[PDB]
Structure formats: C-alpha cells, structure tokens
C-alpha cells in the first residue's frame, strides 16, 4: 500500500533515505494486533480512529483526554491518515492527568493493569505497550515496565527529553524494554533527545503531525513522538508474523537505517526504525 503526501515520519520509516513523502507498508496494517497507549488518554471518537479506539482505564475523575498529548501519540501508532499502523485496535489508559502529570505509583499500576488487560483484548497478532512518558531515576518503575514485557507485551518507551544519557530516566533505563530517541526530517538527532548505551532505536519525534483532541491535527515534538512510530511499527510487524512481543526490539534494530543520523554521541546506537517493506 501506498499513501501519499504523508507525514514525513511515516515515510521515514518505510524509506532507506530521507527526503520522500509517500509511506509504504503492507495493507495488513496491524489488523489483529493491540496498543495500549498508556498516557493522557485518547479521544476515541476521532474520525481518525474509526471506531478502532476505546479507554479502557482510568485513574482520574474522568477518561477523557483533556490534553492532547495521548490523543496525538495514539494518532501516530493507528490513526487513518497520521498512524503506522492503520488497522491495530487502541486502548487508552489514563495515568496522566490533563497537565500531562502522574504520580509514579499511579504509572506503575497502569502498567501493571495492562499486563492483565491483555487476557481482556482480543489480540491474536500480539500486544504492545506504548510509553511517551518518564521522569528521573526509579527501580520501581523500571520493575513495573519490565514485568510488563516480561507478560507477553512489546513495551516500546520514550528516552526522554533532556538532551541527556538516559541512564538516569524511568522507565527510559529499563534494560528489557525498548527505548526510543527522537530524530528530525533531516536525519539528525533531535536537539533534545536524551541518548546513552540504554537506548535501543531512534523514531521520527520532530514535528510531528497527529491527532489532537476537539476532532483535530497538530505539529508537536519529542521522544514523546518517536515512541508511538516504534510501537506502532511493533504492532505491524507481528500482524506480519516477522516478530513477536519478545523479540520485536531486537528485530527493529536488527532491520534498521543503519548509521544514517547525525550528531549520535559515541556509544549510543546509530539506528533508525524503518519496516523494510518492499512494495
Ligand atoms: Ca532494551
């Protein structure tokens, strides 16, 4: 398949050069596999989802998104026109609040929730966890992302926006997940991208366009916005039967751009997510 004009993180990563605009993927499009978008929540009555959306969890007075943030990630692994992978089915859960915070305990146990979800979703492709959130340093939370993928999903989580070694973000520093730095259309790092020997591939995270909540599209930046291009590439890759919940990381980076961004800091992977469909 073939959907021209998209946003250029999508053609990013089904190209082996930057600079197009056109995304390719297989039509499968990550029908039979599950995301958990696992943030601010998602406007699931966006045209863009196509009915494909649902909250299942909240840990607030409501589960609506009241922020934007989850909506946009969401948008970026299964929207219509903004997703990678166009047929996966999303479910929200709300551990942040509408100023885009969460307490980490509150992180922990949407985590946790999700672990247990699974067995609620039909998912016969597999299921992946999409994490665009972190903050300093804690066991707790890094324990809590990795029983996650130990349980049988792909954890895809976002370095983090300090322009600094991850080692010191939660869950960014969880050795079994998958952590995910932010490039621009120009195959450079993102300026604030965090980095490090905990990373484990680079997404599309500068300017951005997705989803947003009131029904609407937005340009917005971060490792927030790289982690759903990874996840929803996870997604499509086990529809496709190349890969499985365990193994999905391994086989991005296997499969990836391979020394192609620039300003990448010695020991940190010189890697780019890209799906390696042949049309
Ligand atoms: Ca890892």
């Known amino acids: ?140 939370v890094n324990s809590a992302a990795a029983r996650l993928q130990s349980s049988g999903v792909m954890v895809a989580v976002a370095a983090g926006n300090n322009n600094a070694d991850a080692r010191n973000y939660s869950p960014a520093s969880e050795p079994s997940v998958c952590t995910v730095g932010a490039s621009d259309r120009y195959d450079r790092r993102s300026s604030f991208s965090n980095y490090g020997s905990v990373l484990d591939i680079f997404g599309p995270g500068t300017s951005i366009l997705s989803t947003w909540i009131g029904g609407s599209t937005r340009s917005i930046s971060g490792t927030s916005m790289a982690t759903p291009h990874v996840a929803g590439l996870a997604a499509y890759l086990m529809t496709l039967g190349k890969t499985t919940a365990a193994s999905a990381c391994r086989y991005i980076a296997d499969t990836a751009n391979k020394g192609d961004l620039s300003n990448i800091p010695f020991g940190t992977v010189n890697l780019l997510a890209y799906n390696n469909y042949q049309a």
């Not at 004009?5 to 499009?29: C, H, K, M, Q, V």
């Not at 998104?65 to 709300?94: E, I, W």
């Open 1 to 140: 398949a073939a959907q021209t004009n998209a946003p250029w993180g999508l053609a990013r990563i089904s190209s082996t050069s930057p600079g197009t605009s056109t995304y390719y993927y297989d039509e499968s499009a990550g029908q039979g596999s599950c995301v958990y978008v696992i943030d601010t929540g998602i406007e699931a009555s966006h045209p863009e989802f196509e009915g494909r959306a649902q909250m299942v969890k909240t840990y607030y007075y409501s589960s609506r998104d009241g922020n934007g943030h989850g909506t946009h990630c969401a948008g970026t692994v299964g929207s219509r026109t903004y997703g990678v992978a166009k047929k996966t089915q999303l479910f929200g859960v709300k551990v942040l609040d509408d100023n885009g915070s969460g307490q980490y305990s509150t992180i922990i146990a949407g985590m946790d929730f999700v672990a247990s979800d699974k067995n609620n979703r039909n998912c016969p492709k597999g299921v992946v966890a999409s994490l665009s959130l972190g903050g300093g340093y804690s066991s707790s």
